[PDB]
């Protein structure tokens, strides 16, 4: 018998050809839905799948695009806001990794910057390299002056653009790169080295004696009409700033904008199963933010600003929190395309094995269908072990939990042997009679074994073979046991 099989017949019942004697029950825990997985022969779809996290997304379409070099797919949300899919539908990831990104129409920023982290309800999770800032959860009143500082090192003689002056892109403050627009120059009387030139063309001015005002005090905090100095009251909401350039210390303003952050980026509705078998997958589009207050941008690039990450916080706690896949079937009856993310587990069904000398025929049978709500601990498969010859079943080893061997008395075992009148000697069902032993008149019995039914002329008996055991032999078997051919 199989290691995990179980007898189904009782000690003494007649057994026919093809009758099932053993069966092993294979069950799957946390059973959500159950797939078809037909095991009939060698069908293409035999690997039964359970599924517990069926997903039916709202309006969000995948399709076939080969644009931008070779090939990739892009998502849309509600009105068409682009959820760019950075990873193929074969990520094999579980959590903590990005699955969609947001566009940066306004977040496509300028070269430099002076970030003022102001009243933004950002997260609290130390960057630790791979975080690119914290996640902005709800609140936003962010302030940013995008001041376009250009970093290049040269000397005063090579500064044909001079310093503390405005000039178009024709002549530049540069020696290795090229300028972009009207180059307001700014050099703080630097010898043999300098810093990032702070070009301030938006709100050029010439105000004098700057570093004594009540508003420009290295931090600004300037409103729409905060008067830095008497006479000239500001009009724009920009920050009042000064640069010690022309004629000793000078004042040059810079335009400032607001980067107010609304609520978390919206995923409209995912019909992903949450309370089905306690597997609750969720996707939260949450925007992120880079370097904090005291790391004002001084480089020259488009510097990628706020980056929305599609968190996949699923359930409360599981193996790597999702143990999921991200393959996409069809969406509905309309042959559209929609990404789906479920939890799968592999269940293996062994191939059928034909008859053999020491084993029997095995047929597995399925008791499930294409889809049905089931409970954890539900039997999926039944592997049935049958017989190859009829007769009686006997020798059911009662044991405790180790029913391993079964015995079937076939018709060939019993042999009809013609003999004497069968007189009233001890000869009764049970007596063991050996070949060559004496009988009613010394007639030789041509067979050996145990007599069961005495006939008027026959003593039909089951065949056996005596094995003489000398005193002191180390026994290797117990009484009433079962043995195979070539066994000690």
UniProtKB/Swiss-Prot annotation:
Full-protein interval shown? 490 to 977 of 1318
Name the family the entry cites. Belongs to the RNA polymerase beta' chain family. RpoC2 subfamily.
| Natural source organism | Synechococcus elongatus (strain ATCC 33912 / PCC 7942 / FACHB-805)
Can you tell which superkingdom this protein's organism belongs to? Bacteria
Q: How does it assemble?
A: In cyanobacteria the RNAP catalytic core is composed of 2 alpha, 1 beta, 1 beta', 1 gamma and 1 omega subunit. When a sigma factor is associated with the core the holoenzyme is formed, which can initiate transcription.
The record describes the protein's role as:
DNA-dependent RNA polymerase catalyzes the transcription of DNA into RNA using the four ribonucleoside triphosphates as substrates.
Q: What name does UniProt use for this protein? A: DNA-directed RNA polymerase subunit beta'
């Amino acid at each position: 018998l199989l290691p995990g099989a179980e007898p189904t017949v009782k000690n003494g019942d007649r057994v026919e050809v093809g009758d099932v004697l053993a069966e092993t029950k294979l069950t799957t825990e946390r059973g959500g839905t159950v797939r078809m997985g037909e095991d009939n022969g060698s069908s293409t779809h035999r690997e039964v799948e359970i599924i517990t996290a069926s997903v039916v997304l709202d309006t969000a379409t995948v399709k076939a695009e080969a644009s931008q070099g070779r090939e990739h797919y892009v998502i849309e949300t509600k009105g068409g806001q682009r959820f760019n899919l950075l990873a193929a539908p074969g990520t094999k990831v579980t959590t903590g990794h990005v699955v969609a990104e947001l566009i940066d129409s306004r977040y496509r920023t300028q070269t430099g910057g002076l970030l003022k982290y102001s009243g933004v309800e950002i997260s609290k999770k130390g960057r630790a390299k791979a975080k690119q800032g914290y996640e902005v959860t709800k609140g936003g009143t962010l302030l940013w002056i995008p001041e376009e500082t250009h970093e290049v090192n040269k000397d005063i003689s090579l500064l044909n653009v001079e310093d503390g002056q405005l000039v178009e892109a024709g002549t530049e403050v540069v020696k290795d790169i090229f300028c972009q627009t009207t180059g307001i120059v700014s050099v703080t009387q630097n010898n043999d080295i300098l810093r990032e030139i702070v070009i301030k063309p938006g709100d050029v001015h010439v105000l004098d004696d700057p570093d004594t005002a009540a508003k420009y005090d290295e931090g600004r905090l300037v409103n729409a009409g905060e008067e830095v100095f008497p006479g000239l009251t500001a009009e724009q909401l920009v920050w009042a700033e000064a640069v010690d350039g022309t004629d000793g210390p000078l004042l040059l303003l810079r335009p400032v904008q607001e980067l107010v952050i609304p609520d978390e980026p919206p995923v409209p509705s995912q019909d992903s199963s949450q309370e089905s078998s306690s597997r609750s997958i969720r996707l939260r589009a949450v925007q992120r933010l880079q370097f904090q207050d005291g790391e004002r941008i001084k480089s020259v690039e488009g510097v990628d600003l706020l980056r929305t990450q599609l968190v996949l916080e699923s359930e409360e706690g599981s193996s790597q929190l999702s143990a999921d896949i991200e393959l996409l079937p069809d969406s509905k009856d309309p042959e559209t395309l929609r990404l789906q993310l479920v939890i799968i587990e592999p269940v293996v069904i062994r191939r059928d094995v034909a008859s053999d000398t020491t084993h029997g025929s095995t047929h597995t049978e399925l008791r499930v269908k294409d889809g049905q709500k089931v409970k954890p601990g539900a039997v999926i498969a039944c592997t049935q072990i049958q017989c190859k010859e009829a007769g009686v079943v006997r020798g059911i080893q009662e044991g405790s939990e180790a029913v391993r061997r079964l015995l079937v008395e076939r018709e060939r075992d019993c042999v009809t042997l013609d003999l004497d009148v069968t007189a009233a000697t001890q000869l009764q069902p049970g007596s063991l009679i050996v070949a060559g032993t004496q009988l009613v008149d010394g007639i030789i019995a041509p067979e050996s074994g145990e007599v069961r039914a005495i006939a008027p002329g026959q003593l039909q008996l089951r065949i056996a073979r005596p094995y003489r055991v000398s005193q002191g032999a180390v026994l290797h078997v117990e009484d009433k046991g079962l043995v195979q051919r070539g066994d000690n």
